[PDB]
Amino acid sequence: MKIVIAPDSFKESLTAQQVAEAIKRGFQQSIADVECLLCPVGDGGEGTVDAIRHSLDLEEKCLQVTGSFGQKEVMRYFQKEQLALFEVADLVGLGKIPLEKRNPLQIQTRGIGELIRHLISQEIKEIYIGVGGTASNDGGIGIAAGLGYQFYDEDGNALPACGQSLLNLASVSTENRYKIPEDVHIRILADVVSPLCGHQGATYTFGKQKGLDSTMFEVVDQAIQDFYEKVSPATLKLKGAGAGGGIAGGLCAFAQASIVSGIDTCLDLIDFDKKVSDVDLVIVGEGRLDRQSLAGKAPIGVAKRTPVGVPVVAICGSLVEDLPSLPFENIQAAFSILEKSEPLEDSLKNASLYLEHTASNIGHLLNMPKI
Amino acid sequence: MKIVIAPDSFKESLTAQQVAEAIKRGFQQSIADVECLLCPVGDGGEGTVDAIRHSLDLEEKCLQVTGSFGQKEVMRYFQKEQLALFEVADLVGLGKIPLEKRNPLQIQTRGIGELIRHLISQEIKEIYIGVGGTASNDGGIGIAAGLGYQFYDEDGNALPACGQSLLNLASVSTENRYKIPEDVHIRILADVVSPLCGHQGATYTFGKQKGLDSTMFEVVDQAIQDFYEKVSPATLKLKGAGAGGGIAGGLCAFAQASIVSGIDTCLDLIDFDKKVSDVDLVIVGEGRLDRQSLAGKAPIGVAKRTPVGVPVVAICGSLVEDLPSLPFENIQAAFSILEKSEPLEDSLKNASLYLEHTASNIGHLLNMPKI
Known about the structure:
31% helix, Rossmann fold, 371 residues, Glycerate kinase, domain 2, 19% strand, 2 domains, five-stranded parallel sheet, alpha/beta, 12 helices, homodimer
């Protein structure tokens, strides 16, 4: 019996790789003679790159680039031939910026632009960018500045490249703008269709979680709009241009990048379609399983690509009550790993162990005879 | 496919019968040809008699007895063939007395004695009594005062019958002591091993859980110990005698009652053995499957009685961390119905929907062809 374990990561608890391994123990502990293929995935959220890295041989490289606060910092990315990959969070990620230094309007992102230029010079044709888990809200101006663009206010001053400056933006020079070769494809793995500006835009949707008082929302969101009205108004219509506090947009208007399905892309990169060829069972999952995760998130993404006749089972951190009755399509069952009423932070902490227990219990049920 | 659903009750949530019906539903929607036999069980806790009545025909009878505050109350008991069962909770039960009048030392339990005498006068030889979920803490004097014993204070006045009088108890007259026929057997179904006194006795273990304040712990506990030292010293050694604020002790001391395994006794009454003689799956479970009291729990008891070769799946409200590795004591799998992190109060209310979903998910895993 071959089981393909393709879980997403558990937000604030475990990487997809850790989830997959915990599930594998449970099954090895309960089903004799069983092949468990680990195939951790991602839907575009932070960690999605590390997941792909487990199914695709890549080489880790580093590059000294401008950090989130000016000083030179080393950024990472992964290559394989003319293919490269990297997470924008590896530079300006929230998970590496202590709260004492959290002003989404002070953070710099140009370093991302620099990374791209070096990749092109290195003869790289396919650049997959992960966005998300970011702590910045600069509508993307950093990517612009990082690609040539220069800004000025009501006075011909340099104007520091940061979100805060978008407030005092007037003059804009698009002279020495870096040109991306037409044979180079940049793709942003998206996990959300949030637009640049608006109530559902980047500033209103993710501004609070990353140190921005609601008062500045209505103002900053406005400055971001004017900025694009001048340089690239067509970007204001792009679906997921809001991801990364506007970084996704900056990448579309200045790096000619396009935003694609985070999960579908990930699945193609790791050869999921081949890995599930002639398989008995497929395990799916994520931290919270809701109506949306069954709409276009990792879980359903994996299920949709599973051969006909192959049962799919979900093992999640938790299930919301607004879930459709199962089986849902090919998803035959869905389990929550929670074991007892306890604080949330204790569940997240024992998730690995809980995951194993659930895999074992499920295993035992499968080992059960038939009468 | 024959299934026997033998769950215990889910304290402060559902009766064993309700739990079983919810589980049944889940299986009737996930398994094509399911034959579900509901067999609710109890281990002595409040609700046990009710579970028994679903598998054993008993005529419901009433009796005008002395209530918990003096006035006349109508207690209930159930008789079959020379046999009778009743729960002490039906008179002094916690789930039958609001906190407005909640004063554990002011509650009178002589009504239980009254009922027992009536049972004997009805020529009943087998009496099974459940002691659980009580609201009183009188060490059991109420049982004695209900069986003939009389008490007097420091100067010689007839002291009222309640925990409080234990504090002014000066002397006890054993004259009008009611004599229990030698052909009468009063057995107590207890789910606790708590002794009468001490730091793990009736007062200290369950006194505050409802009523008594911590400041009066020593006074009441010592006052109770003095009472037995004067009338029934050995009873102070009986395990479980602490059940029901001491009522289990009183019964043993003044009614020549014995303390038996609640769950095991219950399985015999409902005729569980034959019910599962040729079945394929037995479902068990309770509100909280814990280790500190693992051995003794209703679930494991029901399990160890399931025939050889018959898989047992436990479905519980929650599971403690110290649970042994599966399988253990016939239990092949142990699920928690929990779906998400939420206050215990919400899980208790949704308990019914959760059980249905968990049984549903289990059935689907059972319908999957084996390899």
